[PDB]
Subunit: 223 residues, 2 copies
């Protein structure tokens, strides 16, 4: 089994962006408006054959969401967004869980919507980069998750069969797309993410309330 980990929110804590939304909007909760708008427009650009780097879509969506609230935004707010977005810390439950999955024989790789950047990366800064055999990104496909090309070109890079792979994400949109390409999908329940249940939409193969509980299950599934 190769475990393929979404990075933003899944491994790294998105709520470390809170202070920025607190400041600009007077409300940290506006993070939960901005993030889905960001994912929405990433998927919009994809569906219409357009592409800009994830971080750029991110800053433009921050501008729009600020305009939507009639909140002032200056190019410094934007710079901080960029600092914070590329410096999210690992949830404390990650290193311990990844160690166990590594001790149990699983191969470990990352897959992110983020465009690579000159060192150090968010995973480097968070202290968890070293756990992973490869760090994949959509920048190479020039399409965002959940586009199928993203999952097939990941299986191809890794020289693996669909059934050997598992997509780990706290995003139900991130897994549905991988399962649709024959992968398994494991959902980790980060705050403000819960599985979407819609008829005819495959549930995640595994579900944990945290990275430790999800690892319990990927490891149990071995035996």
């Amino acid at each position: 089994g190769i475990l393929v980990f979404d990075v933003n929110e899944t491994l790294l804590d998105l709520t470390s962006l809170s202070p920025l939304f607190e400041r600009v909007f007077g409300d940290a909760k506006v993070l939960r408006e901005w993030f889905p708008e960001l994912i929405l427009y990433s998927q919009t650009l994809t569906l219409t054959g357009l592409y800009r780097p994830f971080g750029e879509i991110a800053a433009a969506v921050f501008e729009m969401v600020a305009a939507n609230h009639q909140a002032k935004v200056t190019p410094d707010d934007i710079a901080e967004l960029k600092t914070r977005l590329t410096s999210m810390p690992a949830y404390p439950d990650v290193a311990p869980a990844l160690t166990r999955l590594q001790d149990a024989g699983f191969r470990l790789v990352t897959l992110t919507n983020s465009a690579p950047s000159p060192a150090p990366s968010p995973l480097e800064k968070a202290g968890i980069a070293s756990f992973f055999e490869a760090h994949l990104t959509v920048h190479s496909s020039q399409r965002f998750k959940p586009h199928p090309s993203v999952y097939d070109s990941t299986a191809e890079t890794l020289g693996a069969k669909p059934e050997e792979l598992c997509m780990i994400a706290c995003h139900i949109w991130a897994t549905i797309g991988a399962q649709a390409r024959g992968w398994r999908g494991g959902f980790v329940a980060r705050p403000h993410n819960t599985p979407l249940t819609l008829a005819e939409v495959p549930q995640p193969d595994f579900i944990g309330r945290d990275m430790g509980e999800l690892a319990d299950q990927l490891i149990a599934s071995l035996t």
Copy 2:
């Protein structure tokens, strides 16, 4: 030329859903979290070759958002969401603006993410149905906007070339996908919508703070 109007939020008032979010979330602003989640999972199913009717995605997403906030939801909140979603009233600025455009020679059609329904339709109940030669829906394409199939198959049902058409929406993601198929796009700025300005993504051809102002500019563009 043919003016093609998005229906939900563009012609009909999405904020008429506020009382439901007030009651359930203790905050009407949770509308601006749920809506982008809904558009997101609509684009997600599309990208991964899945399809369920819009109103079902809407209900599923409302469940999920309530679970995210740990707010209680029974199937009655759900029925009210179906009532409210299919009974949104027209903004007061619509009938007058549609009259001018009809008077000025434009053909007028609707295109919605929503599935064809029991009589009466939302546009029927809003009193504005009769302005339009055709009410088109993505249910027949089986793919959500901004998928290019939706805009090419609308061009065909109508028997028009891309440059004869203009997509009117308060959603910048809705106009982007139409301009990509060579249509024109006109943006009406309903509350909590402002255009996304991102490098290499074509801006709307027309912009209006309201439907009356957007009408001026379609009408001016004739002479």
